Structure 1
Amino acid sequence: SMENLVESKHHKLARSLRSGPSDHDLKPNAATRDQLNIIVSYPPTKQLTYEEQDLVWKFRYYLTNQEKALTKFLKCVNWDLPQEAKQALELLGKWKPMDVEDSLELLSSHYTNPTVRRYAVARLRQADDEDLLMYLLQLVQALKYENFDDIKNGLEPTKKDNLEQDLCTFLISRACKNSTLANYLYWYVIVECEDQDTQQRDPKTHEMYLNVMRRFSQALLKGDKSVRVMRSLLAAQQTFVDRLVHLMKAVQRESGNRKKKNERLQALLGDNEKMNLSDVELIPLPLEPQVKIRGIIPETATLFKSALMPAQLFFKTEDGGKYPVIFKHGDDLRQDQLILQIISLMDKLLRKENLDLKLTPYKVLATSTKHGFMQFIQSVPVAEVLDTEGSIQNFFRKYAPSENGPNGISAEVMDTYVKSCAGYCVITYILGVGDRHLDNLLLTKTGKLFHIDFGYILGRDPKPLPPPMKLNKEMVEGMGGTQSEQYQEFRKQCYTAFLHLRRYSNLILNLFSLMVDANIPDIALEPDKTVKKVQDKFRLDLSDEEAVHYMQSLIDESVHALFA
């Protein structure tokens, strides 16, 4: 049953499909090649066939030549037989150089073969700070690495008691090249050193990862220059923050009323926080590896009055200025750290397309032991700001009388608003944000829109939920009047925007294919449905701007919504 009957099939299938294709190399002949050029130009998701795989296993010359087509063929094969491996490693060299983009797909667990992994590093050989943006998603891909850690465990822990194959020195050569990519990446890594006892307990391999992080620290420190000890020291100084958040866990425990806890905090921070903040020698900021602290002012220090204990404080830096900051401690904030990071990646591509969404990517990181910190925010969070004002128009006029409601002309406040609004709807289409309300709506009076509730995603709401668009009946006041101008400008910006992201988000499909290996809740069910849903939701299947007409009908239905 799972006996020779199972294998018999495999042979008959191996014969003719193997042995036939791969022979003495020459160029493809027929005009079916022109049709096939279209067929191969099918996107990443477009998984290959039992017969199409065979065709490429024939048509090698054009595949060699089309420098970036190689990957589609690499999707077809596996390194099942040494004879396969032989032709595969032959052709690895033969093929006109692969795309550094398409180099991401081949690092997947699909292709366990070291030579591929070694050569993919050459395909994406550019040791540059672009990797820092890649650090916004790569951790789930890095989760497919817990095999070679046991191999390199033979080496890295042992020895201390550019052209290369060693991914760890690809890492060292690229990352140690910049202090940001060393230290901030280590703090990012500290979020995975957190809870490593479960990855030791269920897997065992987190103990190997603890050895790995130890041996990376050894590999850096053995570099033996001022730079190498200094980065080891700045981590140590930043680790004092862990002591401070344990003290802040104790201060949180001595609660009273909002004012009584605030007084206890202001007093305890007055002695302890002023002394420690002044005491530390130029350890860097959470928002910036370059900014460094030289004080904290316990006077203006305040708190969000909620169980997460979000902080609101200001730090007299080495640079003189009193930088605003926020911590959240006693929360595994990984849902938000990943979301803001991916947002940053999307924002980079979107800025490569010259549209800025005016959203605030606030920095977030972890120093040690599940404690963490982030960039602070100034806000006007609710419909109550607009209700304190006379209307959406009166709200503009009050704050910025250049706008002066309808009677003035607001310039960039309005421009930033319209281009921002045209951005925020696109973000809501893709991310499927949940639990939106009139109280999750930080209208910065300057033109910067902040809709904010990203923690609920993939439509997480009880049954009725927020739309893929970004509009409500309050905005329907101002926008219904400024329909001719602002709704059209909204409509034109978003129309042009989607059409540009339809160009090049194919690489995000590769990123998605690796970054999907992360922690985000209920992922036990969602994957295959999600990959299909993404391609369908943005209907890459149908590049018809009539879909925007369908969406514009939904927009009509949105103003209609009291009866639609």
Structure 2
Amino acid sequence: RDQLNIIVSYPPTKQLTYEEQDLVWKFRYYLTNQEKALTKFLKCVNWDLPQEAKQALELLGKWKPMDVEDSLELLSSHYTNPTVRRYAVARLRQADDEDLLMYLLQLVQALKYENFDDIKNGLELEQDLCTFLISRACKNSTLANYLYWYVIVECEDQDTQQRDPKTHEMYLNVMRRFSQALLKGDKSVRVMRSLLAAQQTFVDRLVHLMKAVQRESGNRKKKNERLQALLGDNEKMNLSDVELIPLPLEPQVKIRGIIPETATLFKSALMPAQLFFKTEDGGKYPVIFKHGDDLRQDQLILQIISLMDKLLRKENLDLKLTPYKVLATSTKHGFMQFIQSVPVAEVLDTEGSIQNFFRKYAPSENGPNGISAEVMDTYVKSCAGYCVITYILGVGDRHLDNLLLTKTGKLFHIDFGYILGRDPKPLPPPMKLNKEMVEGMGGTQSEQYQEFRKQCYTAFLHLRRYSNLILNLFSLMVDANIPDIALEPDKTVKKVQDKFRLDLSDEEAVHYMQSLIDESVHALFA
């Protein structure tokens, strides 16, 4: 009946009532070939009663196997049954590394829901999350790299060390188990350990270099010259000439070192560094090296933006997004991929507007407002894409210093210090959209505006379809040391859930999205 289809449609986090539980339970045998009924059914099971547990796992066997997207729910805190947890890993094994990599950050966090004793006893349908992740890491260099940096930061975490010494020791063990597996492997596998160790030394030497620059009082010019001098002496610092190691930030990129003479410090409180990595093929890879600050909140947000971009691209909707790489190398430092762009604040300061800026660096006679057709389409798509993504992620503290623009027309957001409905000012707008963006398209009477609205609807409807995956991924982050999560862990997933408005139809959703843009665009006139 229809009452069953309304119950299975529920978000992964929607808590079923006792009345709703005993209903799914009664009709369990009639739901066995319904893929999206299994999670709802496993919720209903009295995992304490042996006869119920027994019949439930019998049903788990004969049940239509679930999607990887839905399987992520089985790895959360709500599940403790070892069979249900091995089943979750068994479905997760069906995913390819490309997908697995998209979920890895949350999978490292999901280890704190695993059996700590099994992880320990492994030192010196049958695989747990630890064995599975190490297994996959041994076969894929990229995966091994992120499993290393994700676990090392959780080991380093001093807040976990004191608050949960049990979880801290579990991660030390995950690292020991990983190191053990690497040494028991093939020629290819055994060299991954020395590669991870070489990058760890590299980062340690870079951390020391940043400190060597700050030991003094000096002009930014003098500090820049102190950075350049220290990077130049490869005999002492060994940072300008290294055996081609993976770049922790993007391991597919193999680096020779940092170019000494082009390295500088940013005009910013913690003076992060701009460093150019010499890649194996003579190319340059610019990075931001941030010290004395925690990148984990940005690292999560950029990981979700990347996922959202891949999902949209999958549905043949490339909205020209900039999911720049963010990697924390400690709870105190890390890397960000430097993107050549200009903050919108500076766009207004130097050129007066986004339109002027575009007319200057990308003109064309009969193009929209004398601007390149390609640059304008890129701008409309990226605006729409970010308007929707920042709306869902509840990104606050939006100002024109953390809104960046490229000369190719790419608009994007940076610095995700405020997320999930948090903002320095009270009553913040739900739709993160300003008059500078709107004026960039050519105002509300422009064909570009209608196109922007259209792209906002398309993105929303496609992202709404992946609500199960996104909410499951957030549910694995509830107990992570992410400031804006740690504030209200118990309320985190619902904050994301409510933005999808999964209560509304596709037609109803586009009207709500349509009204939200209007209510925001008319609020810009007060």
- For the criterion TM > 0.5, the same-fold answer is yes
Q: Aligned with 1:518: secondary structure?
A: coil
CA separation of 1:189 and 1:403: change in aligned 2, threshold 3 A? farther
Kindly tell me: are residues 453 and 223 of structure 1, through their superposed partners in 2, closer, same or farther at Cα, counting changes over 3 Å?
closer
Aligned to 1:38: 6
Task: Kindly provide the CA deviation profile for residues 430-457 of structure 1, in whole angstroms up to 9, marking residues without a partner as x.
Answer: 1222222233332212111123242222
TM-superposed deviation, 1:471: 3.3
The offset of 1:339, in angstroms, is: 1.4
Which has the higher mean CA deviation after the structures are superposed, 227-236 or 283-292? 227-236
Query: How far is 1:487 from its partner?
Result: 0.9
User: SS where residue 429 of structure 2 aligns?
Assistant: coil
Structure 1 residue 404: deviation in Å?
7.3
Residue 235 of structure 1: how far off its partner (Å): 2.6
Quick one: distance in 1 between partners of 2:238 and 2:81? 51
Q: Note if contact 2:152-2:330 (Cα within 8 Å) is conserved in structure 1.
A: yes
What do residues 262-318 of structure 1 show as CA deviations (whole Å, max 9, x unaligned)?
222222222248962343111112343232222432112211022322111223332
Per-residue CA deviation, residues 51-106 of structure 1 (Å, 9 max, x unaligned), is 33223333233122324422211110122122222222322222232333222212
State how 1:159-174 maps to structure 2 within 5 Å: 164-174=126-136
Task: Tell me the CA shift for residue 192 of structure 1.
Answer: 1.1
Secondary structure (helix, strand or coil) at the match of 2:356 reads: helix
With over 3 angstroms needed to count, the CA separation of the structure-2 counterparts of 1:376 and 1:150, relative to structure 1, is: same
Partners of 2:391 and 2:430 within 8 A in 1: yes
What SS class does the counterpart of residue 515 from structure 1 fall into?
A: coil
TM-score (structure 2 length as normaliser) = 0.89
Check conservation: 1:153, 1:208, Cα contact below 8 A.
no
Cα contact 1:237–1:280 (8 A) shared by 2? no
Q: Deviations over 1:95-150 (max 9, x none)?
A: 23233322221222322111111222223332631354334541574253353346
Q: CA deviation at 1:155?
A: 4.9
SS in 1 for 2:288: strand
Asked whether the 8 Å contact 1:128–1:174 carries over to 2, the reply is no
Q: Distance in 2 between matches of 1:391 and 1:279?
A: 43
In structure 1, the residue corresponding to 2:412 is in which secondary structure? strand
Runs of 4+ aligned residues of structure 1 deviating over 6 Å after TM superposition are: none
Distance in 2 (CA, whole Å) between partners of 1:529 and 1:315 is: 41
What SS class does the counterpart of residue 343 from structure 2 fall into?
A: coil
C-alpha distance 559-501 of structure 1, shift in aligned 2 (>3 A): closer
Query: Taking structure 1 as reference, are residues 285 and 412 closer, same or farther at Cα in structure 2, changes over 3 Å only?
Result: same
RMSD over equivalenced CA pairs, Å: 3.0
Distance across 2 between alignment mates of 1:321 and 1:502: 40
Deviation at 1:45, TM superposition (A): 3.5
SS at match of 1:64: coil
Taking the aligned partners of 1:66 and 1:406, their CA distance within structure 2 comes to: 50
* Partners of 1:279 and 1:295 within 8 A in 2: yes
Single out whichever of 512-521 and 174-183 deviates more from structure 2: 512-521
Q: Cα deviation per residue 1:519-557 (whole Å; 9 max; x = unaligned)? A: 222545524444444333332112264565455455445
User: How many angstroms does 1:414 deviate by?
Assistant: 0.6
Task: Tell me the CA shift for residue 368 of structure 1.
Answer: 5.7
CA contact 1:340–1:362 (8 Å) conserved in 2: yes
Whether contact under 8 Å (2:344, 2:354) holds in the other structure is no
Q: Is the CA contact (8 Å cut-off) linking 1:274 and 1:297 kept in structure 2?
A: no
Change (3 A) 1:373 1:477: closer
Deviation at 1:416, TM superposition (A): 0.6
- In structure 2, which of residues 257, 260, 274 is the aligned counterpart of residue 298 of structure 1? 260
Partner of 1:481 in structure 2? 443
Contact kept in structure 2, 1:421 and 1:470, CA below 8 Å: no
**1:219: Cα distance to partner?**
1.9
Q: Secondary structure at the match of 1:48?
A: coil
2:471/2:496 contact within 8 Å kept:
no
- Counterparts in 2 of 1:466 and 1:448: CA distance versus 1, 3 Å: farther
- The residue aligned with 1:153 is 121
CA distance 1:226–1:45, change in 2 (3 Å): closer
* Structure 2 alignment gaps of length 5 or more: none
Give, in angstroms, the shift of residue 477 of structure 1.
3.8
Given that 1:429 and 1:469 are in contact with CA atoms closer than 8 Å, whether structure 2 keeps it comes out as: yes
How far 1:423 sits from its partner (Å)? 0.6
For the residue of structure 1 that corresponds to 2:299, the secondary structure is helix
Indicate if the aligned counterparts of 1:329 and 1:371 stay in contact, CA closer than 8 A. yes
- Contact 2:394/2:419 (CA < 8 Å) preserved in 1? yes
Q: Is the 8 A contact 1:190 1:366 kept in 2?
A: no
Deviates more, 1:529-538 or 1:414-423: 529-538
2:275/2:288 contact within 8 Å kept: yes
Moved more, 337-346 or 388-397: 388-397
Residue of structure 2 aligned with 1:47, choices 3, 6, 15: 15
Query: Among the aligned pairs, what percent are the same residue?
Result: 100
Deviation digits for residues 412-434 of structure 1 (CA, Å, limit 9, x no counterpart)? 10111111111111022112222
Q: Tell me, in whole angstroms, the C-alpha distance in 2 between the residues paired with 1:257 and 1:120.
A: 56
Greater Rg by CA: 1
User: Which aligned pairs between 1:59-98 and structure 2 lie closer than 5 A?
Assistant: 59-98=27-66
User: Aligned-pair distance for 1:200?
Assistant: 5.5
* Contact 1:286 1:375 (C-alpha < 8 Å) held by counterparts: no
Of the three residues 72, 76, 82, the one matched with 1:114 is 82
Q: Give CA-to-partner distance per residue, 1:30-68, whole Å, 9 cap, x none.
A: xxx455344433443443232332233332331223244
* Aligned length in residues: 526
Q: Note closer, same or farther for the CA distance 1:280–1:531 as it changes in structure 2 (3 Å cut).
A: closer
Q: Is the 8 A contact 1:440 1:452 kept in 2?
A: yes
Judging changes above 3 Å, is the alpha-carbon distance between structure 1 residues 61 and 306 closer, same or farther for their aligned structure 2 residues?
same
Query: Tell me, what secondary structure is at the counterpart of 2:105?
Result: coil
Q: Distance in 1 between matches of 2:459 and 2:131?
A: 40
Please give the TM-score of this superposition, normalised by the length of structure 1: 0.84
1:145-176 deviation digits (Å, cap 9, x = unpaired)? 353346643755xxxxxx52444332233221
In structure 2, do the counterparts of structure 1 residues 94 and 376 end up closer, same or farther at CA, with 3 Å as the change threshold? Answer: same
Q: Greater shift after overlay, 140-149 or 486-495?
A: 140-149
User: Does 2:349 match 1:387?
Assistant: yes
Q: Is the 8 A contact 1:286 1:365 kept in 2?
A: yes
- Distance in 2 (CA, whole Å) between partners of 1:120 and 1:202 is 25
- Please tell me whether the aligned partners of residues 221 and 232 of structure 1 are also in contact (alpha carbons under 8 angstroms): no
